[PDB]
A paper describes a structure:
Recently, Toxoplasma sporozoites were subjected to detailed transcriptomic and proteomic analyses. It was found that, in addition to the well-characterized “generic” AMA1 and RON2, sporozoites also express two paralogues dubbed sporoAMA1 and sporoRON2, respectively, that are not expressed at detectable levels in tachyzoites or bradyzoites. To better understand the mutually exclusive nature of the interaction between the sporozoite and generic AMA1/RON2 pairings, we set out to solve the crystal structure of apo sporoAMA1 and of sporoAMA1 bound to a portion of sporoRON2-D3 (sD3). The results presented here demonstrate that invasion of Toxoplasma sporozoites depends on the interaction of two previously uncharacterized proteins, sporoRON2 and sporoAMA1.
Overall, the structure of apo sporoAMA1 conforms to the expected three-domain architecture observed for other AMA1 structures, but reveals several divergent substructures including a network of apical surface loops that provide an unexpected degree of integration with the apical groove. In addition, sporoAMA1 loop 2 is slightly longer than the analogous loop in generic AMA1 and has an N-linked glycosylation at Asn230 that is positioned atop the groove. Loop 2 folds in over the top of the groove, and positions Pro227 directly over the tip of the DII loop, which appears to compensate for the lack of the central anchoring tyrosine observed in generic AMA1 (sporoAMA1 Ser252; generic AMA1 Tyr230), with Pro227 effectively pinning DII loop Phe376 and Trp377 into the base of the apical groove. Based on the degree to which the apical groove of sporoAMA1 is guarded, numerous specific interactions between sporoAMA1 and sporoRON2, particularly in the predicted initial binding site at the cysteine loop, are likely to be required to overcome the energy barriers of DI apical loop rearrangement and displacement of the DII loop.
Numbering used by the authors: 96 to 477
């Protein structure tokens, strides 16, 4: 009884998507998987759906990270107003960023990318960066944020994703006098905007590949598992890094992204250091800069524990290689959206059913019923 998820091009293409260290290959919470010219550079190959940078400027401020980043200091404003958005104008006087997707389609041409995410990544990948200190052109690549509501593409000249600690930044104006307010990445689900954060390297090769290669969506009525003993066995309390209750599935979706063990390239140590300058837009690359490579607790199973009446978010850190179809369960990642897709259909006419071994008169049977994957227990003592 072989893993049917390797048994078919369509099943194998679907499972491959969830091999995150392979297909993404960089941090997810904070992505700093590359370095160039001495700076940490955003590097993952997969778009990160719903990723926003939460800021903490005092109440009167805009506190919107898609705001123009500052072009000059004002020593008299602490913290300095601004977001992460690249604020350069073209010599025509048109802004670099944000740009309407409409226009990008025009500017990329007849053979440009067929997805808004591919366009926005390519647009970033093509943008000639400029050192925010020396003021000289650089080979550094900016990350991007596509907003699927405004249909606008943003290129961020600020590539920093996580700034923390009262030595280095203010929360809501405390301590006072700090140049930078604090900030950290968060999954958001808002009706007003629908964000996708990515490195420019989404564009590299085929900018549209993410659609097919990456774990863009939650999987409905299925759990991530591991094939063993002729059966998909889902990850649960036994085999997870945490498995606390969640009030609802969206909370689980947010949790996996924010969880302390998610693949992340943030420095785990705190070098006694002076305050960042107003224009330290890019993290400096140090010999000890961590690279998760996208290994970590990046997957979450959301299910109703039959035993206890509670919904569980079971976050785990193994690459899964099958799905257990279970009605009402959801499989999430730190990369994907909370929007839900089905398991690939299944061909009932040819699909060969696979039987687990009999243990205590119950075996697990995987079949195709009405063209859908089915996993059930079956009595096997007469
Ligand atoms: C960078 O160029 C700007 C002009 O846009 C200038 O105001 C600033 O002093 C320069 N920064 C340097 C070279 O320190």
């Amino acid at each position: 009884g072989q893993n049917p998820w390797a048994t078919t091009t369509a099943f194998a293409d679907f499972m491959k998507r969830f091999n995150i260290p392979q297909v993404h290959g960089s941090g997810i919470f904070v992505d700093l998987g590359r370095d160039t010219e001495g700076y940490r550079e955003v590097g993952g190959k997969c778009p990160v759906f719903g990723k926003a940078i939460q800021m903490h400027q005092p109440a009167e401020y805009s506190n919107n990270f898609l705001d123009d980043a500052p072009t000059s200091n004002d020593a008299s404003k602490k913290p300095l107003p601004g977001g992460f958005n690249n604020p350069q104008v073209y010599t025509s006087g048109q802004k670099f960023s944000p740009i309407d997707d409409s226009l990008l389609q025009e500017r990329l041409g007849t053979a440009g990318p067929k997805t808004a995410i591919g366009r926005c990544a390519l647009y970033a990948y093509s943008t000639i960066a400029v050192n925010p200190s020396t003021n000289y052109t650089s080979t550094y690549k900016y990350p991007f944020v596509y907003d699927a509501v405004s249909r606008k593409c943003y290129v961020l000249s600020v590539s920093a994703q996580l700034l923390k600690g009262e030595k280095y930044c203010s929360v809501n104006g405390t301590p006072s006098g700090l140049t930078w307010a604090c900030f950290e990445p968060v999954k958001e689900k808002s009706s007003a905007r629908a964000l996708v954060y990515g490195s420019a390297f989404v564009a590299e090769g085929n900018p549209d590949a993410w659609q097919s290669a990456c774990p863009n969506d939650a999987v409905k009525d299925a759990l991530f598992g591991k094939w063993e003993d002729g059966q998909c066995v889902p990850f649960d309390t036994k085999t997870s890094v945490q498995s606390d209750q969640a009030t609802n599935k969206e909370e689980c979706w947010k949790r996996v992204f924010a969880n302390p063990l998610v693949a992340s390239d943030a420095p785990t140590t705190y070098p006694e250091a002076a305050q960042k300058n107003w224009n330290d837009f890019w993290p400096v690359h140090e010999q000890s800069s961590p690279k998760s490579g996208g290994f970590g607790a990046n997957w979450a199973n959301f299910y109703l524990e039959k035993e206890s009446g509670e919904t569980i978010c079971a976050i785990f850190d193994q690459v899964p290689d099958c799905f257990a179809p279970i009605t009402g369960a959801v499989a999430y990642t730190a990369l994907g959206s909370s929007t839900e897709v089905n398991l690939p259909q299944c061909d009932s006419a040819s699909f060969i059913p696979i039987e687990g071994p009999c243990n205590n008169c119950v075996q697990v049977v995987t079949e195709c019923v009405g063209n859908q994957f089915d996993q059930t227990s079956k009595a096997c003592c007469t």
